[PDB]
């Protein structure tokens, strides 16, 4: 009988929740992402910005090799910090710019030991001695705290920002504020489903909430507009036209922007002309009878427009179907049964043409990021339409078989959300470490041309890059392992800035310490991304094998080296890995690593991408859905009911449950479901009275319909995508889908089967 997920999450919330977590100790283990506590910097970076698979690295490569516990970090550079927590500080080192070690170039952080009266500071990453520049000098005091420390953030805090000097800028000149380019697919499909009008009408409202720093009065971000369908229609909206102009470019293939001035204006100054256009586009193409559309040319065009205005940008593309019109990036309908052991299954997840990767590189080269709002209704080849937006650091939103009376609010919520996102532009992240190990692998919505620079055309508060480290030499149980993430970027106001995250981990020659300091949620986030990237390179059965064998290997190692002698009939698991099997099984059961019977490639590709960008908070929930019982709900005096295991076993014919993984939100109803509840929630008197196909928000209700709506809100709270509600009636209804998220049941193998499997190979490693 194993320590279930719920128990593990609850126990931590008990002992660590509602308490202050001061990041003052080195290899200090933080609470689980599932636990709500207050965090005060004080030295090392907040666990909200960066968590690790272990907060105590093995000292040598062979040790690491024995254990096989991947050493990595999940980094969310711009993670939203709670209102009740202290915000980052902006350090300006003047003309010279931020002080950095001359050897490894690490920034001035709390990890620099000031010596010799405070004239020379030895660097903590490579041990090189530096000369404290003139203007920066300061006297040490008792053991060297410099008398500066607590006054200067860069000296006392884990996270903070530096002002970037011109040599941190492209062409050594002050960058320009970014621009937003809206590109609307106006082919038949989106004209009919009333999407075009929706986007135009609703765009008049949202264009106002466009982000701008407090220090300024109006947003420095300009805007541009485009429509298309195998042909592009640019629009001139200069702040001096009573009427907007339209320029059609039909030369797809060798696309170009027919403008400069009139394309990318201040929404405020050109307000009335833009609205004018926005009222018009819907009518304009109303009778369009065009069905085929292009794609690569659109991304191509926006990037071009940005390169011209010489500024970074973000493309908000609204597409509907598989782009078939002849032009570069023409996509066919290549959905084949090349899987399960095809060894060639990988090709299904890669883009068709070789153009998309190139386009992605050109975009990144010019600080152009592409976010795609896709409204498919049939195969669309997501492995292709989502590459540029993944590699470019954009976001991909898919709304399958869109229907206005149901999905309107979901999409509009996503769009508002995505526009108001705190975002940085034309960034490059670099992860420096101390002597002994180094960043050797990266996973995330990123692009990399060399082996050290993680390029992100655009980065936001939700995006998390996962970094794998490897041993370079040997680490000291004395100095431990340091990590300094640094993201250089351009702000929406046009300023070059640096965000720094320092984190001190412990080191050790003792395996006990390695395990004692692991975080299952971290480890799972790594394995997921690691495997999900492998899909594009090795047979899935090859990936699954590595996952299972690495899992059994880790536990075997712990068993033969740390665990106190116990009977062979038992299976030992360190507290750090109590729930690792459960979660690992979930990854293996997931559709990305599974197969054909149901689930579209489009759905597999989509999920494979969404996860690649996730942080620990996100991945935890995605793989182990949260299941809340609603029938047993405490009326008005709630605070979100206790979670229940992801098994069918915890469902009752008399109950009503809420299951959410962060993307989908199911409202399950049993047959013997109390008519009292079904009334105060769906306003209909009985169970058989509800229609699934009507998954829209139900108001009214005084005690319950309100109390349920409350929890649905608090659940969506910290979640980036707005979930798609789906009501399920127990006995033989759509429920088939629902059962998939009951990740503990067999559905692959059940949690129990997998546990039973690991033990076999752990025994095989006869010890």
């Amino acid at each position: 009988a194993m320590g279930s997920p719920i128990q593990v999450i609850e126990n931590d919330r008990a002992s660590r929740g509602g308490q202050v977590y001061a990041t003052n100790t080195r290899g200090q283990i933080p609470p689980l992402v599932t636990t709500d506590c207050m965090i005060q910097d004080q030295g090392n970076a907040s666990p909200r910005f960066i968590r690790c698979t272990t907060y105590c690295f093995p000292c040598t490569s062979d040790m690491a090799k024995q254990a096989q516990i991947p050493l990595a970090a999940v980094i969310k550079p711009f993670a939203t910090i709670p209102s009740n927590e202290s915000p980052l500080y902006l350090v300006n080192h003047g003309e010279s710019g931020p002080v950095r070690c001359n050897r490894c170039k690490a920034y001035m952080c709390p990890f620099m030991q000031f010596i010799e009266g405070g004239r020379r500071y030895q660097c903590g990453f490579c041990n090189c001695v530096n000369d404290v520049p003139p203007f920066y000098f300061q006297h040490l005091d008792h053991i060297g705290r410099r008398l500066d420390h607590y006054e200067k953030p860069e000296l006392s805090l884990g996270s903070y920002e530096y002002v970037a000097t011109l040599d941190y800028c492209r062409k050594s000149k002050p960058p320009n504020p970014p621009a937003f380019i809206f590109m609307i697919d106006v082919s038949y499909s989106n004209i009919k489903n009333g999407l075009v009008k929706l986007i135009c009408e609703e765009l008049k409202t949202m264009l106002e909430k466009i982000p701008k720093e407090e220090q300024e009065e109006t947003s420095a971000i300009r805007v541009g507009f485009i429509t298309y369908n195998k042909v592009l229609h640019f629009f001139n909206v200069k702040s001096n036209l009573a009427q907007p102009q339209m320029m059609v470019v039909t030369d797809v293939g060798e696309v170009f922007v027919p403008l400069l001035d009139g394309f990318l204006v201040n929404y405020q100054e050109s307000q009335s002309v833009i609205h004018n256009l926005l009222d018009q586009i819907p009518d304009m193409f109303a009778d369009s009878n065009e069905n085929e559309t292009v794609f690569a040319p659109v991304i191509q065009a926006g990037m071009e427009a940005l390169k011209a205005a010489d500024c970074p940008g973000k493309l908000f593309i609204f597409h509907s179907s598989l782009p078939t019109a002849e032009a570069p990036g023409k996509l066919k309908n290549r959905d084949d049964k090349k899987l399960v052991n095809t060894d060639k299954e990988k090709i299904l997840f890669q883009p068709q043409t070789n153009v998309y990767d190139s386009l992605a590189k050109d975009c990144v080269a010019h600080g152009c990021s592409v976010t795609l709002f896709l409204f498919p209704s049939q195969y669309v080849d997501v492995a292709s339409l989502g590459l540029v937006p993944q590699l470019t650091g954009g976001t991909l939103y898919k709304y399958n078989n869109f229907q206005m009376h149901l999905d309107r609010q979901q999409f509009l919520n996503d769009l508002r959300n995505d526009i108001e996102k705190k975002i940085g532009f034309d960034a490059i992240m670099r992860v420096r470490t101390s002597t002994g190990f180094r960043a050797t692998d990266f996973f995330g919505g990123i692009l990399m041309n060399n082996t050290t620079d993680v390029e992100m055309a655009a980065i936001d508060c939700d995006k998390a890059v996962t970094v794998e480290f490897k041993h370079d030499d040997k680490l000291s149980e004395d100095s431990g392992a340091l990590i300094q993430c640094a993201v250089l970027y351009t702000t929406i106001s046009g300023q070059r800035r640096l965000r720094i995250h320092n984190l001190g981990l412990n080191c050790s020659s003792q395996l006990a310490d390695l395990y004692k300091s692991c975080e299952t949620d971290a480890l799972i986030n790594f394995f997921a991304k690691s495997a999900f990237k492998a899909v594009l390179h090795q047979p899935l059965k090859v990936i699954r094998e590595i996952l299972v064998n690495q899992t059994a290997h880790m536990l075997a190692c712990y068993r033969k080296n740390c665990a106190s002698p116990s009977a062979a009939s038992q299976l030992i698991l360190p507290d750090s890995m109590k729930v690792l099997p459960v979660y690992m099984n979930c990854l293996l059961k997931n559709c990305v690593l599974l197969s054909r019977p149901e689930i579209s490639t489009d759905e597999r590709a989509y999920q494979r991408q969404l996860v690649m960008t996730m942080g620990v908070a996100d991945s935890q929930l995605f793989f182990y859905p949260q299941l809340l019982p609603i029938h047993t709900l405490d009326v008005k005096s709630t605070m979100l009911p206790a979670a229940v295991r992801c098994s069918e076993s915890r469902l009752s014919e008399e109950g009503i449950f809420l299951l959410a993984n962060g993307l989908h939100m199911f409202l399950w109803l049993g047959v013997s479901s109390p008519p009292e509840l079904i009334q105060g929630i769906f306003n209909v008197p009985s169970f058989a009275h509800i229609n699934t196909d009507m998954t829209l928000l139900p108001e009214v209700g005084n005690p319950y319909s309100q109390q349920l709506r409350m929890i649905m809100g608090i659940i969506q709270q910290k979640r980036p995508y707005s979930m798609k509600l789906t009501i399920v009636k127990q006995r033989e209804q759509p429920e088939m889908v629902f059962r998939q998220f009951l990740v503990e049941d067999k559905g692959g193998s059940s949690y129990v089967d997998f546990l039973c499997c690991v033990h076999k190979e752990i025994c095989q490693l006869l010890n």
């Binding site: 009988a1 194993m2 320590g3 116990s566 009977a567 009939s569 038992q570 299976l571 030992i572 698991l573 360190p574 507290d575 109590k578 546990l755 039973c756 033990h759």
Partner: peptide
């Protein structure tokens, strides 16, 4: 955490 495999 110990689990006896029955």
């Amino acid at each position: 955490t110990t689990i006896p495999m029955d």
